Amino acid sequence: EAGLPTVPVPIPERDLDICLMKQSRRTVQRGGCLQFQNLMYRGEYLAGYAGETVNLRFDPRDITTILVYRQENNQEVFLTRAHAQGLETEQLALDEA
Amino acid sequence: EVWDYEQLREEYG
Amino acid sequence: EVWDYEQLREEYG
Amino acid sequence: EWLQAEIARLKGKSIVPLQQVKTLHDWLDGKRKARKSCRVVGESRTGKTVACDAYRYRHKPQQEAGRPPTVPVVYIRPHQKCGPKDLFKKITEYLKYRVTKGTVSDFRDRTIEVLKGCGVEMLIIDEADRLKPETFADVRDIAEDLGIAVVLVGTDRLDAVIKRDEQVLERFRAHLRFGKLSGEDFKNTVEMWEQMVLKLPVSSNLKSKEMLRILTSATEGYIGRLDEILREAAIRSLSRGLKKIDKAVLQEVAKEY
Amino acid sequence: EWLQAEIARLKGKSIVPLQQVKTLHDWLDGKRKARKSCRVVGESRTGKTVACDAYRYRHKPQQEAGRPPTVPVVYIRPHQKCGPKDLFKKITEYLKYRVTKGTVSDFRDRTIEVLKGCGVEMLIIDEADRLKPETFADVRDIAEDLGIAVVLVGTDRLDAVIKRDEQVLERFRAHLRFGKLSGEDFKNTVEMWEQMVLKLPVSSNLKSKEMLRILTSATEGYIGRLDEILREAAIRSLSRGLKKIDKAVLQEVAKEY
Amino acid sequence: EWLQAEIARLKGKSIVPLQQVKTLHDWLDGKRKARKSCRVVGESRTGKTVACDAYRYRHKPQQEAGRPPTVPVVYIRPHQKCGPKDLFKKITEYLKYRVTKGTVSDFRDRTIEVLKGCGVEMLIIDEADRLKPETFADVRDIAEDLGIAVVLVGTDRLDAVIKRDEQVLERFRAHLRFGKLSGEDFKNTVEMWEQMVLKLPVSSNLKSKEMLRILTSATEGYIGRLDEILREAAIRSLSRGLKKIDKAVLQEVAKEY
Ligand SMILES: Nc1ncnc2c1ncn2[C@@H]1O[C@H](COP(=O)(O)OP(=O)(O)OP(=O)(O)O)[C@@H](O)[C@H]1O
Ligand SMILES: Nc1ncnc2c1ncn2[C@@H]1O[C@H](COP(=O)(O)OP(=O)(O)OP(=O)(O)O)[C@@H](O)[C@H]1O
Ligand SMILES: Nc1ncnc2c1ncn2[C@@H]1O[C@H](COP(=O)(O)OP(=O)(O)OP(=O)(O)O)[C@@H](O)[C@H]1O
Ligand SMILES: [Mg+2]
Ligand SMILES: [Mg+2]
Ligand SMILES: [Mg+2]
């Protein structure tokens, strides 16, 4: 408590979580579909980005709601939550999948 | 309602 | 009753 | 001669009025009244094609003297990789017209002209997964520009094709599922076959547990497996000189699956 | 007869003056004043086509004796893989001209000639994603050589096509979004459908929370799901003697989607 | 009515003496003196077409009594998929001749005859990437056999096309790059638009910090975004009975981009 140059900022816990999520590369393909571990997903703006690779963040405890990111101006930007179609109801862990 | 959709075509020609 | 595939094909004519 | 005549019957096809057929028909009748597009989905050999043929045969082309026929229900099975002209040719040749050599635009205008005037109100596309991605736009335009209930039929392959075009997905999302048979319906279905399809001169007793249990394991409740096993079992039993299917031939058949 | 008339009516189609429609109309009026090309983008069955149809009907051609018509707004919905002659065909036929067989150059020159003098101010291309990439050059030339606001309408499939040509992307950058309904807006919309579309002998009270829960779940707020579900449920109700939607038949319809 | 008169002006188009335009004109004057073929390249809506169009007006056809016109600069924008006959028609009809139906050889020889005698020094081909690979050989033969500086204008899509034939690429190596505005150059351009183009009854101070911030981010320095944003923002303000572009109106436009 005495040896801190300044008291740390109270981190927004969703931001911590978002940067704790592991991530993979896939390309949005035809119809705004993207494959990830046999599941398929889509979200509210995906199809406009069909044809290029996007960065998407996943939590192995619940893969059903992916967060997907574009790279533009060589900067990361969030697109939308890509939901596993028909599974937007209860959680699925990666290990059984 | 606004219109019958088929009736608009006969109105429009 | 049963519907014969031949009978329904011929009756269709 | 006896043997050839009963075998030439048994190698044929026949349509049994399953409850699965009736629920489809009552559903397609509601969809046709609403002109509502929809899809029929279910596992292979669940009877989807035979039930759709049965629906088409109940809603016959009506003749009127010197008119083109009134055809309420069109049924087509596309060939694989069905493009727009292939679809238009199949529709226009189901109505009693020849195609003339022409552009895709000529085939379209002629198809739209004859889907009207023949008074078409439902179009069933069996194995709709054979449609090319581009031709679904003409299917959607038929469903949108005319008040026609388009019925897409296929297995889960169709859901894999449809979900890759949200405009198709969102138009054909109303569905009916064809199931496996089971239980008392499966028992009741087996009972019908020997008396309504096979009609060998002596009772086969296929309902009996030692037969019914094998048929359960061999067919798994697929109506197509149930039919093809029993037809082949009757044919082989007759060819051995027997008046009926014996369990020995039934085991001899069921082991081939 | 009552029943056949009500089913033939309610199988039909009608336009409801939703807020999304008025919002697009005010935005399109601004773009038409400024002659600014733009795009309308939104998910399937959000109502974009109906709202663009409603706009051209508010802006009907003005007839003048012995002149060709003054047609401020042209609306076209291209066929799949729309080439440049197909596009010129669509526009000239909309202006009440007949095409004469000829070259692409003849079709272009004739189209430009009639876009002039018919006084066209806005060209709406519904499902512009069906245009071939070569066809967008001729759409840009219409927008650039003439004082015509071109409006491309599509799903996000359009944006995937637009981004593939910088010159299209930079001309059609201004956009309006069509989104899902929610909240009070969904509640007032279902209330309007029961008041002014279903027109049934008895009130259905779909506004009430335990029915609103069913509609919100099945429709996801898509207006096209809402419309198709309620008409189907009504036709089912009237066919079975129910003088209103009842929660059971509503639940039966919603289950199919 | 004054509002409709101001809207009729603002929805129009005008040419502003920007520094980028001046830079191109001096460069094109040097290429025309040397009869040196070159390309002008730059992102869409950086103003290349306006700058080339302003050039041909500054070097317009010079009349001599009973002669064909002396035309130093020919400017053409080819139609999509321009073949050689289309190119020859484009050039010959710019020179105020009428093409007569004929072979490609007839069209070529007449074009060559009128490129001489009209004393053409420079041929600017805007959107040169619309040329077929077939017709680039005739473009090169015009540059080589006549003393003519051909100027190919386009985006990076032109460089992609040009790269596919060494003979085109190596003749059109010299280039001038159009680019995005920034900094004081962008700041001066916005103040010049308020002065010269908008001409509103009250100063909008569009070069103020909170205005420059949203204009910088919406336009990204594209002159075509700046023009079309300020046009519609002025139309909206004047339609609203404002005598100024207000900050909120400009923010409403900027969010559409
Ligand atoms: N109602 C029925 N009556 C008699 N036999 C039937 C019936 N339904 C199915 N069959 C038998 O099952 C076979 C397969 O049925 P059908 O062709 O209709 O299946 P399907 O679901 O359309 O199959 P697939 O998806 O593989 O094309 C028939 O050819 C026939 O042998
Ligand atoms: N304003 C409205 N009033 C009444 N019904 C409407 C309205 N808007 C939409 N609908 C209903 O929703 C259906 C789908 O709407 P619409 O065809 O306009 O969708 P869309 O957004 O153009 O779809 P897509 O992108 O799939 O072509 C209509 O055909 C109609 O049944
Ligand atoms: N010098 C200028 N003065 C005024 N407005 C200009 C000027 N240059 C460009 N603009 C504005 O920018 C718009 C686009 O410019 P222009 O047509 O020259 O672009 P371009 O570089 O040829 O584009 P593209 O490569 O996409 O065809 C013009 O229509 C006009 O609104
Ligand atoms: Mg089948
Ligand atoms: Mg639509
Ligand atoms: Mg240009």
Short mmCIF file of C-alpha atoms in Angstrom, two decimals, chain E residues 2-243:
data_model
loop_
_atom_site.label_atom_id
_atom_site.label_comp_id
_atom_site.label_asym_id
_atom_site.label_seq_id
_atom_site.Cartn_x
_atom_site.Cartn_y
_atom_site.Cartn_z
CA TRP E 2 -68.19 -14.67 -45.62
CA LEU E 3 -65.50 -17.32 -45.07
CA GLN E 4 -64.16 -17.47 -48.65
CA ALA E 5 -64.23 -13.67 -48.87
CA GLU E 6 -62.38 -13.18 -45.56
CA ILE E 7 -59.72 -15.75 -46.48
CA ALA E 8 -59.32 -14.25 -49.97
CA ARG E 9 -59.01 -10.80 -48.38
CA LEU E 10 -56.67 -11.70 -45.53
CA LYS E 11 -54.41 -13.84 -47.69
CA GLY E 12 -53.89 -10.47 -49.43
CA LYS E 13 -51.51 -7.58 -48.79
CA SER E 14 -51.76 -4.05 -47.41
CA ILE E 15 -49.56 -1.14 -46.31
CA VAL E 16 -49.56 0.21 -42.74
CA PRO E 17 -48.19 3.76 -42.15
CA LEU E 18 -45.34 2.77 -39.83
CA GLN E 19 -42.83 5.28 -38.46
CA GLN E 20 -40.03 3.60 -40.43
CA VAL E 21 -41.97 4.37 -43.61
CA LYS E 22 -42.40 8.07 -42.81
CA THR E 23 -38.74 8.30 -41.79
CA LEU E 24 -37.57 6.85 -45.10
CA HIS E 25 -39.95 9.13 -47.02
CA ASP E 26 -38.59 12.29 -45.37
CA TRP E 27 -35.02 11.11 -45.99
CA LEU E 28 -35.77 10.20 -49.62
CA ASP E 29 -37.44 13.60 -50.13
CA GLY E 30 -34.23 15.28 -48.95
CA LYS E 31 -32.06 13.14 -51.21
CA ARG E 32 -34.40 13.82 -54.13
CA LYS E 33 -34.22 17.58 -53.47
CA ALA E 34 -30.42 17.48 -53.22
CA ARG E 35 -30.21 14.97 -56.11
CA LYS E 36 -27.94 12.96 -53.81
CA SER E 37 -27.22 9.29 -54.44
CA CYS E 38 -27.48 7.08 -51.38
CA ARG E 39 -28.33 3.59 -50.15
CA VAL E 40 -31.03 2.00 -47.99
CA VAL E 41 -29.76 -1.01 -46.02
CA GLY E 42 -31.49 -3.34 -43.60
CA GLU E 43 -32.07 -6.98 -42.73
CA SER E 44 -34.57 -9.12 -44.64
CA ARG E 45 -38.29 -8.49 -44.05
CA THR E 46 -37.66 -5.20 -42.23
CA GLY E 47 -40.03 -3.55 -44.70
CA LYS E 48 -37.67 -1.73 -47.08
CA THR E 49 -39.41 -2.83 -50.29
CA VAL E 50 -42.88 -1.92 -49.00
CA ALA E 51 -41.57 1.48 -47.89
CA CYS E 52 -39.97 2.12 -51.31
CA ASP E 53 -43.18 1.03 -53.06
CA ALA E 54 -45.18 3.38 -50.82
CA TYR E 55 -42.86 6.24 -51.84
CA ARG E 56 -43.28 5.91 -55.61
CA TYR E 57 -47.05 5.75 -55.08
CA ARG E 58 -46.99 9.04 -53.19
CA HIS E 59 -44.93 10.30 -56.14
CA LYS E 60 -47.10 9.01 -58.99
CA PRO E 61 -46.41 10.08 -62.58
CA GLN E 62 -48.01 13.34 -63.65
CA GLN E 63 -49.96 13.05 -66.90
CA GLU E 64 -49.77 15.81 -69.49
CA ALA E 65 -51.76 15.77 -72.71
CA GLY E 66 -49.71 14.32 -75.58
CA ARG E 67 -46.43 14.41 -73.71
CA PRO E 68 -44.71 11.37 -72.27
CA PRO E 69 -45.36 11.11 -68.52
CA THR E 70 -43.41 13.14 -66.00
CA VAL E 71 -42.09 10.45 -63.67
CA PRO E 72 -40.08 11.92 -60.76
CA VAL E 73 -39.41 8.55 -59.07
CA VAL E 74 -38.53 5.38 -60.97
CA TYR E 75 -38.54 2.14 -58.98
CA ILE E 76 -36.96 -1.04 -60.37
CA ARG E 77 -36.30 -4.48 -58.88
CA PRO E 78 -33.71 -6.12 -61.17
CA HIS E 79 -33.67 -9.79 -61.97
CA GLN E 80 -30.74 -11.84 -60.71
CA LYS E 81 -27.46 -11.17 -62.56
CA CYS E 82 -28.84 -7.95 -64.05
CA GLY E 83 -26.70 -6.94 -67.00
CA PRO E 84 -26.66 -3.47 -68.53
CA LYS E 85 -29.29 -4.21 -71.21
CA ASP E 86 -31.47 -5.79 -68.50
CA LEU E 87 -31.08 -2.59 -66.46
CA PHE E 88 -31.90 -0.37 -69.46
CA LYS E 89 -34.86 -2.65 -70.26
CA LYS E 90 -36.23 -2.18 -66.73
CA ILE E 91 -36.00 1.62 -66.76
CA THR E 92 -37.41 2.22 -70.26
CA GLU E 93 -40.33 -0.17 -69.70
CA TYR E 94 -41.09 1.60 -66.41
CA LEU E 95 -41.39 4.91 -68.29
CA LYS E 96 -43.99 3.23 -70.59
CA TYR E 97 -41.67 2.82 -73.57
CA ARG E 98 -41.18 -0.40 -75.50
CA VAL E 99 -37.62 -1.50 -76.13
CA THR E 100 -36.56 -2.20 -79.71
CA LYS E 101 -34.03 -4.96 -80.36
CA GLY E 102 -30.59 -3.43 -80.66
CA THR E 103 -27.15 -2.95 -79.14
CA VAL E 104 -26.30 -2.06 -75.55
CA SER E 105 -25.39 1.35 -76.98
CA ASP E 106 -28.88 1.77 -78.44
CA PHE E 107 -30.44 0.72 -75.13
CA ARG E 108 -28.21 3.12 -73.19
CA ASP E 109 -28.83 6.07 -75.51
CA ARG E 110 -32.58 5.41 -75.53
CA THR E 111 -32.65 5.10 -71.72
CA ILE E 112 -30.76 8.37 -71.23
CA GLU E 113 -33.07 10.04 -73.76
CA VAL E 114 -36.21 9.01 -71.86
CA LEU E 115 -34.80 9.65 -68.38
CA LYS E 116 -34.51 13.15 -69.75
CA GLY E 117 -37.90 14.63 -70.54
CA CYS E 118 -39.73 12.21 -68.33
CA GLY E 119 -38.08 14.47 -65.75
CA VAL E 120 -36.82 11.61 -63.59
CA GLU E 121 -35.36 12.90 -60.33
CA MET E 122 -34.78 9.67 -58.38
CA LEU E 123 -33.99 6.09 -59.43
CA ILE E 124 -34.53 3.41 -56.77
CA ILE E 125 -32.83 0.07 -57.48
CA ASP E 126 -34.34 -2.49 -55.11
CA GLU E 127 -32.01 -5.41 -54.37
CA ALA E 128 -29.19 -3.62 -56.15
CA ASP E 129 -26.92 -6.51 -55.09
CA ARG E 130 -28.36 -8.39 -58.08
CA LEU E 131 -26.56 -5.98 -60.43
CA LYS E 132 -23.51 -7.36 -62.17
CA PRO E 133 -20.33 -5.40 -61.29
CA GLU E 134 -20.14 -4.08 -64.86
CA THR E 135 -23.68 -2.72 -64.48
CA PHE E 136 -22.76 -0.31 -61.66
CA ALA E 137 -20.69 1.77 -64.09
CA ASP E 138 -23.87 2.57 -66.05
CA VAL E 139 -25.68 3.30 -62.77
CA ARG E 140 -22.91 5.72 -61.78
CA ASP E 141 -23.17 7.36 -65.21
CA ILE E 142 -26.91 7.87 -64.70
CA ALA E 143 -26.23 9.44 -61.31
CA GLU E 144 -23.36 11.59 -62.63
CA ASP E 145 -24.42 12.67 -66.12
CA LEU E 146 -28.04 13.35 -65.15
CA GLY E 147 -29.41 15.12 -62.12
CA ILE E 148 -30.79 11.88 -60.66
CA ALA E 149 -30.51 10.67 -57.06
CA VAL E 150 -29.90 6.92 -57.29
CA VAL E 151 -30.98 4.92 -54.22
CA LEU E 152 -29.58 1.40 -53.89
CA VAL E 153 -31.73 -0.80 -51.63
CA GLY E 154 -30.53 -4.08 -50.18
CA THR E 155 -29.53 -6.21 -47.23
CA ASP E 156 -25.93 -6.18 -45.97
CA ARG E 157 -25.23 -8.39 -49.00
CA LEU E 158 -25.32 -5.06 -50.87
CA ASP E 159 -22.54 -3.58 -48.73
CA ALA E 160 -20.35 -6.60 -49.52
CA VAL E 161 -20.86 -5.84 -53.23
CA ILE E 162 -20.46 -2.06 -52.86
CA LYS E 163 -17.14 -2.34 -50.99
CA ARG E 164 -15.70 -4.31 -53.94
CA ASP E 165 -15.75 -1.15 -56.11
CA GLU E 166 -14.30 2.01 -54.55
CA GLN E 167 -16.12 4.23 -57.07
CA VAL E 168 -19.50 2.79 -56.08
CA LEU E 169 -18.60 2.80 -52.38
CA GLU E 170 -17.65 6.49 -52.46
CA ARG E 171 -20.72 7.59 -54.45
CA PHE E 172 -23.30 5.67 -52.37
CA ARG E 173 -21.71 6.26 -48.95
CA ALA E 174 -24.67 8.16 -47.46
CA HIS E 175 -27.11 5.61 -46.06
CA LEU E 176 -30.26 5.02 -44.03
CA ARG E 177 -30.66 1.94 -41.81
CA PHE E 178 -33.83 -0.14 -41.43
CA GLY E 179 -33.83 -1.95 -38.08
CA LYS E 180 -35.98 -4.26 -36.00
CA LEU E 181 -38.90 -2.91 -33.98
CA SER E 182 -38.84 -3.00 -30.18
CA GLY E 183 -40.50 -1.67 -27.05
CA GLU E 184 -43.43 0.70 -27.47
CA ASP E 185 -42.93 0.71 -31.25
CA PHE E 186 -43.54 -3.03 -31.51
CA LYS E 187 -46.49 -2.79 -29.08
CA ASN E 188 -48.19 -0.03 -31.09
CA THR E 189 -47.50 -1.91 -34.34
CA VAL E 190 -49.22 -5.15 -33.26
CA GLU E 191 -52.09 -3.03 -31.94
CA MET E 192 -52.44 -1.44 -35.40
CA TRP E 193 -52.39 -4.84 -37.15
CA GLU E 194 -55.33 -6.03 -35.04
CA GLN E 195 -57.16 -2.71 -35.52
CA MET E 196 -56.58 -2.16 -39.23
CA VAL E 197 -55.34 -5.37 -40.94
CA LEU E 198 -57.05 -8.35 -39.30
CA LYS E 199 -60.49 -6.67 -39.22
CA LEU E 200 -61.97 -9.73 -37.49
CA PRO E 201 -65.49 -9.82 -35.98
CA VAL E 202 -64.06 -10.06 -32.45
CA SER E 203 -61.04 -8.33 -30.95
CA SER E 204 -58.02 -10.60 -30.53
CA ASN E 205 -56.35 -8.50 -27.78
CA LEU E 206 -52.90 -9.43 -29.10
CA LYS E 207 -51.73 -6.29 -27.27
CA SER E 208 -52.18 -8.11 -23.95
CA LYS E 209 -48.92 -9.20 -22.38
CA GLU E 210 -49.25 -12.98 -22.56
CA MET E 211 -50.02 -12.78 -26.28
CA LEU E 212 -47.43 -10.03 -26.84
CA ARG E 213 -44.93 -12.45 -25.30
CA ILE E 214 -45.74 -14.99 -28.02
CA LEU E 215 -45.49 -12.46 -30.87
CA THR E 216 -42.27 -10.90 -29.55
CA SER E 217 -40.64 -14.33 -29.34
CA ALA E 218 -41.68 -15.62 -32.77
CA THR E 219 -41.24 -12.37 -34.74
CA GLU E 220 -37.96 -11.13 -33.18
CA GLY E 221 -39.36 -7.71 -34.17
CA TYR E 222 -39.31 -8.36 -37.92
CA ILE E 223 -42.42 -6.78 -39.42
CA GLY E 224 -42.58 -9.46 -42.12
CA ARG E 225 -42.71 -12.23 -39.53
CA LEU E 226 -45.40 -10.27 -37.67
CA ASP E 227 -47.56 -9.84 -40.78
CA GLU E 228 -47.28 -13.44 -42.00
CA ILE E 229 -47.88 -14.97 -38.55
CA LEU E 230 -51.04 -12.98 -37.82
CA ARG E 231 -52.60 -13.53 -41.26
CA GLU E 232 -51.90 -17.28 -41.09
CA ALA E 233 -53.31 -17.50 -37.56
CA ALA E 234 -56.39 -15.53 -38.63
CA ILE E 235 -57.05 -17.73 -41.68
CA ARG E 236 -56.64 -20.80 -39.46
CA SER E 237 -59.01 -19.31 -36.86
CA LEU E 238 -61.70 -18.39 -39.41
CA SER E 239 -61.34 -21.80 -41.09
CA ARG E 240 -61.93 -23.55 -37.73
CA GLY E 241 -64.77 -21.24 -36.65
CA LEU E 242 -62.86 -19.01 -34.23
CA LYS E 243 -64.06 -15.42 -34.65
#
